[PDB]
Amino acid sequence: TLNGGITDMLTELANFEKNVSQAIHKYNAYRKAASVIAKYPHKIKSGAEAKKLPGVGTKILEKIDEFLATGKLRKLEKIRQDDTSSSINFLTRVSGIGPSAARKFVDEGIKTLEDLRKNEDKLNHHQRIGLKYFGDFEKRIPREEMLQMQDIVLNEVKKVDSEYIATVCGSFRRGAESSGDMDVLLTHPSFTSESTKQPKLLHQVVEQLQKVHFITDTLSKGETKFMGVCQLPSKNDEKEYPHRRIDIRLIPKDQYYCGVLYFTGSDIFNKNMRAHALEKGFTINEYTIRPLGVTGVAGEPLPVDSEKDIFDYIQWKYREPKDRSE
DNA sequence: CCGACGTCGCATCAGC
DNA sequence: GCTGATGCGA
DNA sequence: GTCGG
Ligand SMILES: Nc1ccn([C@H]2C[C@H](O)[C@@H](COP(=O)(O)OP(=O)(O)C(Br)(Br)P(=O)(O)O)O2)c(=O)n1
Ligand SMILES: Nc1ccn([C@H]2C[C@H](O)[C@@H](COP(=O)(O)O)O2)c(=O)n1
Ligand SMILES: [Cl-]
Ligand SMILES: [Mg+2]
Ligand SMILES: [Mg+2]
Ligand code: NA
Ligand code: NA
Ligand code: NA
Numbered sequence: 001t002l003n004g005g006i007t008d009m010l011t012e013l014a015n016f017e018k019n020v021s022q023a024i025h026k027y028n029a030y031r032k033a034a035s036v037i038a039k040y041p042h043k044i045k046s047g048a049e050a051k052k053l054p055g056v057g058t059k060i061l062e063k064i065d066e067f068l069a070t071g072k073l074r075k076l077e078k079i080r081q082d083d084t085s086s087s088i089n090f091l092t093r094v095s096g097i098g099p100s101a102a103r104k105f106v107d108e109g110i111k112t113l114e115d116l117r118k119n120e121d122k123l124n125h126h127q128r129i130g131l132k133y134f135g136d137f138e139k140r141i142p143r144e145e146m147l148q149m150q151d152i153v154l155n156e157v158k159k160v161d162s163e164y165i166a167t168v169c170g171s172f173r174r175g176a177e178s179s180g181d182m183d184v185l186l187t188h189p190s191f192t193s194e195s196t197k198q199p200k201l202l203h204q205v206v207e208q209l210q211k212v213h214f215i216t217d218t219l220s221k222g223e224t225k226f227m228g229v230c231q232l233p234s235k236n237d238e239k240e241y242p243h244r245r246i247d248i249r250l251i252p253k254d255q256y257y258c259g260v261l262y263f264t265g266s267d268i269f270n271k272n273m274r275a276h277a278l279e280k281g282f283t284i285n286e287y288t289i290r291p292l293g294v295t296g297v298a299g300e301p302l303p304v305d306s307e308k309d310i311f312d313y314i315q316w317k318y319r320e321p322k323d324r325s326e
Numbered sequence: 327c328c329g330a331c332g333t334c335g336c337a338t339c340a341g342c
Numbered sequence: 343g344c345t346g347a348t349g350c351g352a
Numbered sequence: 353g354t355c356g357g
Contacts (some may be wrong), residue, residue: 026353057354060354069332096351124337126336219336249335270333275330287334
């Protein structure tokens with residue numbers, strides 16, 4: 001990419017602030033700056049040129065000047081040589097190990113993949129599975145495999161109850177030629193903002209996908225959100241496909257458009273759009289868009305009949321899913 | 327200068 | 343058990 | 353770390 005060196009450096013800084021410093025707003029600031037630089041259609045010549053972009057300030061401009069002049073950033077080169085920072089950044093790559101648990105493990109002398117496997121009994125369930133599939137979860141999914149996965153989910157869901165509608169969101173819905181995992185929005189007419197007329201609506205789908213050995217493991221599971229592991233079937237004498245993360249979100253059928261806007265993302269696009277809503281006097285979640293009163297208290301849900309209605313309320317021109325990859 | 331920064335589901339833990 | 347953080351995740 | 357009042 002045009003500015004890949006700069007955006008990589010900002011991403012590494014973001015991950016430092018999140019995993020090591022536990023400064024969530026610094027993390028989002030670095031990610032927002034990397035995003036706006038990622039879509040800037042010129043090869044950046046200076047920090048001052050970049051500071052013109054929203055989300056790039058004085059400090060990142062200076063880092064950009066250091067990186068443009070030397071090809072590196074001293075702050076990162078020192079971070080890379082710090083053993084505690086190295087340890088924590090590695091452990092937080094296991095699903096279920098966040099900043100706090102990573103620092104606690106380092107305190108207990110658990111700092112490597114070998115240490116983690118030595119101490120499985122010190123892991124909760126999510127972490128145990130994240131460690132089990134550590135290699136697999138860092139692999140990307142070709143869109144072709146995403147299409148085979150889509151076919152299985154959609155047909156198995158239709159076998160449970162043909163009134164379900166399952167929609168693959170995330171980067172897949174944004175047209176990506178590869179995805180890091182599969183995100184499935186699910187609706188059923190028995191589950192609306194008004195009533196739940198049928199129980200186990202998510203569970204029944206999960207059970208069916210386990211029964212056919214597509215879903216292989218469960219990280220967390222509630223009434224509306226499943227987070228787990230899945231695997232494509234391989235052919236005779238074929239090497240197995242990697243295991244993949246899968247997220248399934250059951251959304252009230254009448255709130256599908258807010259739900260699919262949320263689950264299509266990206267995460268940064270959602271942050272930018274929800275921040276814009278607030279400046280416009282609305283708050284958006286995966287269910288509703290609502291006005292804010294002078295109170296600052298959210299009012300009653302506004303009528304929504306398309307993703308575009310959401311954009312219109314906040315005075316944004318519509319953006320197709322493929323233009324939301326911020 | 328400095329308050330706000332997106333919003334919420336599930337797992338875990340502490341306090342009663 | 344309930345309730346309210348806190349952690350980690352979408 | 354950046355931004356907006
Ligand atoms: N912090 C977050 C994380 C996710 N989300 C939403 C948007 C996001 O697209 C959706 C799916 O989460 P993912 O983490 O899978 O994000 P994807 O867009 O699918 C990516 Br590009 Br990171 P992939 O999973 O393909 O690697 O959930 C969010 O709103 N806020
Ligand atoms: N998971 C889904 C997907 C779509 N739908 C509904 C919302 C709209 O009425 C319509 C969307 O049609 P389309 O597939 O063109 O996006 O189907 C749903 O209720 N649940
Ligand atoms: Cl709501
Ligand atoms: Mg995804
Ligand atoms: Mg602001
Ligand atoms: Na700027
Ligand atoms: Na992690
Ligand atoms: Na996901």
